[PDB]
Amino acid sequence: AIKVCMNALCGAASTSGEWKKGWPMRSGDLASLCDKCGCAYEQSIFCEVFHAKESGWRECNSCDKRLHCGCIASRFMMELLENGGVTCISCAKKSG
């Protein structure tokens, strides 16, 4: 396959250094991210930097953290609550 940045709103076909590790894709393999997108992802702010204008934002039920929902990039950064809404992964570790 052609290797390209898996941020679909970037799609860069080249990068500085090696490709960076991204989020798990549906197949389980890790996404390839360019130097920019991968840098945001490493700092845990990919969606805040690159999905700021997309729909689907909610907030964590236990803290102020905004969470981009319906998004593969943030998919394992939150938990779906039985009574509605989401909590981020830190608060989820704190609540069992």
Q: For residue 78, what is the DSSP state?
A: E
Given 26, 28, 53, 96, the residue binding a copy of itself (CB under 8 A): 26
Q: What type of residue is 74?
A: S
CB closer to a copy of itself, 17 vs 31:
31
> Applying CB under 8 A, does 73 fall inside the site for a copy of itself?
yes
**What is the C-alpha separation between 14 and 73, in angstroms, rounded?**
20
Contact 74, 67 (CB under 8 A): yes
Shortest distance, position 24 Cβ to a copy of itself, whole Å: 10
Among Zn ion, a copy of itself, none, residue 60 binds (CB under 5-8 Å by kind)? Zn ion
Cα–Cα–Cα angle for 54, 64, 26, rounded to 5 degrees: 45
SS3 48: helix
**For residue 83, what are its two tokens?**
């009574």
Residue among 9 and 63 whose Cβ is closer to a copy of itself: 9
Q: Which positions touch a copy of itself (CB under 8 A)?
A: 6-9, 25-26, 31, 51, 54-59, 67, 69-73, 75, 78, 80-86
